Design a protein around this ligand. Structure first.
Ligand SMILES: O=S(=O)(c1cccc2cnccc12)N1CCCNCC1
Ligand SMILES: O=S(=O)(c1cccc2cnccc12)N1CCCNCC1
Lengths: 400, 398
């Protein structure tokens, strides 16, 4: 029908998940002009003509659309390959955020994943108090930007370095993590990289997961097929580690194993598979059956040792293989301070005391500035480097 | 501007028809970027092979959903030449009759001239004047631009003049409607440059409208328009536009009035005042208009008619209409007791077409067969971008 058509087309233009919404189209055009405006390319009439036709237009667009200079960088609060994360204040709204920058070039400079789609998707649509929230995603010719909510409480790595974590606390966090992961699993993802670095605390001291660059959609059997291991040395599960071209087919248990590693570390202060060198940790992980030993410390409760072991074991017998409910029913969690379904409503073990909306006391210092890093080389022929990053923008068609 | 402002100015830009970034335009940019990239040679680049593999599913569905050629049933061709054929079409779904124009993307690309259509699209889509043929839909594909306009069943003035020995009363009426039409086009800030009987069409009521505006241009600060472009059929073209072969020339709107003069002479005489066997012949006689312009020894043509024709057919500097349209309207030739300017298009036309059906083409000559195998673009080894000149042409009405 002539009506049905105008409508479907209207929906494809609106839907916050359509590959051709205003966000995708404005991006598509923005990408083109960006990937054409080079003297070597302008030699071609069409290109030159087109660009002059859209010169005034494209410029007005880039001034109306969300851009980097719309934010006042309060301070850098995290770095990594592919880019950094900075405490920013939106110049116009005065609203404070944690904006994540991603070097378009760096990711293109061998990253073999396009990981950022998962992260954009999850943080933008999860709508879970366990997931860091993405408010805006925009880009330019050099960086991807992810305007997320700021977690003033800092990460769990920082917390652990400042306190000798008592069981009560360890229980609380392990519990919030378990609920957080369960929520991510519910969205149909295996996290694959559960670690204290990605565990952040809000202004109330409650946990949220950030950084989902390793998340991968589970199949109908609830499994994942991967020939190359992903994650972190200390926390990678024996199966994700051994994952080979021979198959590489594991379930969500790999996350629970990591939770065990997480628990062991809070109580002990060391990782269950620490070694002189990374490669040592590798051997100790595969040999978990023998390498998993607790130091002679009379303070790790029976239950704690039990759960840690229930997690740090071969997938087939690992606690969690039979849904999250069997983890929750473990004795280690048995307490008289909270119940699972109301946990994030109980008072946290460490509540941050913040001086201002931009208080970064719970984040280690970092240099700032650096000096504009090298990006793509000026094209001699049409390369189209902005094409892989079309539709990343989350601004014109976001969900409400 | 607040964040709310900025956000909304942008969100409205996506919905404005008069916007180059409207959703339709943007959808072109993508639709196009798929065509001028989906070549085995270009697939080598991953950013391309990936970009295309991602939008394959989507882009196809899009092209099928949007307004496409096979949405129209071609009733009969009613005009050809230029870069395509004007055909009588009935919308398959709405069952509405339209005059659809086609423009070979390749043909334009081939012989430069791939920018004229912007003016025509704009004027016919936004003029909103009864003196202008209306553009309802403008869509495209990889090969043709399409301009779904309103059908003018009364045919053109060329046809009318070939069937009647135009009397003065009639000549006056049409000259008057042309004058009003052009003035309206001038009001939008355009110099027409190509006023001729071919583009003068009559509606079902026998009233004039201008079609084909692919020669109009925006008047600069002082109301002029420089230009350098070859000239086809100079019969109606003015001395200034002619002496402007190469950009070495700025002319006013009075170039259109000269054409109106040519128009009037032809209706009353039956031939163009500067006709010659060759194009260069006509051109020469046009330049030597101070001497070449003669009237036959049959004083059928009235005093006023001879005056106006001469008032138009003269050097720009002294040409009638250099002091606004009002001095043309006040000419005696138009002095009559049948109509007044401000109500002219409300008076009964000298020739009202009698139509048999909504698809009656009796007032249009049968056209030949093209037999043409419209050449196609060659497979590019790099990025040619033969779609970029036609990006933002797509236009829909509400
Ligand atoms: O800056 S973060 O990358 C970071 C990522 C994502 C969202 C964030 C929200 N607020 C603060 C920091 C955030 N981060 C802080 C210290 C370094 N460890 C990783 C967590
Ligand atoms: O068919 S047309 O091309 C034509 C052009 C533009 C709009 C039209 C609208 N209705 C009918 C014919 C139309 N045309 C009549 C015959 C040949 N002379 C040129 C004008």
């Amino acid at each position: 029908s002539f009506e049905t058509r105008f409508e479907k087309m209207d929906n494809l233009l609106r839907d916050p998940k359509s590959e051709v919404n205003s966000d995708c189209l404005l991006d598509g055009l923005d990408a083109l002009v960006y990937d054409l405006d080079f003297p070597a390319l302008r030699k071609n009439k069409n290109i030159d003509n087109f660009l002059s036709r859209y010169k005034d237009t494209i410029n007005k667009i880039r001034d109306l659309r969300m851009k980097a200079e719309d934010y006042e960088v309060v301070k850098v609060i995290g770095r990594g390959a592919f880019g950094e994360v900075q405490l920013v204040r939106h110049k116009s709204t005065r609203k404070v955020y944690a904006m994540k920058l991603l070097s378009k070039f760096e990711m293109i400079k061998r990253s073999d994943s396009a990981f950022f789609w998962e992260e954009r998707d999850i943080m933008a649509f999860a709508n879970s108090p366990w997931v860091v929230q993405l408010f805006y995603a925009f880009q330019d010719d050099r960086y991807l930007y992810m305007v997320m909510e700021y977690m003033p409480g800092g990460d769990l790595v920082n917390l652990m370095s400042n306190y000798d974590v008592p069981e009560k606390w360890a229980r609380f966090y392990t519990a919030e993590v378990v609920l957080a992961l369960d929520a991510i699993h519910s969205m149909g993802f295996i996290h694959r990289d559960v670690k204290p670095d990605n565990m952040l605390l809000d202004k109330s001291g409650h946990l949220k997961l950030a950084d989902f660059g390793t998340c991968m959609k589970m199949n109908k059997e609830g499994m994942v097929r991967c020939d190359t291991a992903v994650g972190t040395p200390d926390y990678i599960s024996p199966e994700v580690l051994k994952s080979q071209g021979g198959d590489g087919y594991y379930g969500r248990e790999c996350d629970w194993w990591s939770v065990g590693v997480f628990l062991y570390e809070m109580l002990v202060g060391d990782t269950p598979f620490y070694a002189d060198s990374l490669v040592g940790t590798y051997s100790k992980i595969m040999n978990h059956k023998n390498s998993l030993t607790f130091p002679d410390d009379n303070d790790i409760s029976k239950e704690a040792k039990n759960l840690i072991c229930a997690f740090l074991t071969d997938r087939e017998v690992r606690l969690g293989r039979n849904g999250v409910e069997e983890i929750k029913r473990h004795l280690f969690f048995k307490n008289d301070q909270w119940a699972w379904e109301t946990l994030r409503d109980t008072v946290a073990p460490v509540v941050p005391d913040l001086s201002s909306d931009i208080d970064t006391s719970n984040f280690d210092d970092l240099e700032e500035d650096k000096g504009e890093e090298e990006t793509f080389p000026i094209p001699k022929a049409f390369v189209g480097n902005q094409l892989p990053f079309v539709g990343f923008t989350y601004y014109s068609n976001r969900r409400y």
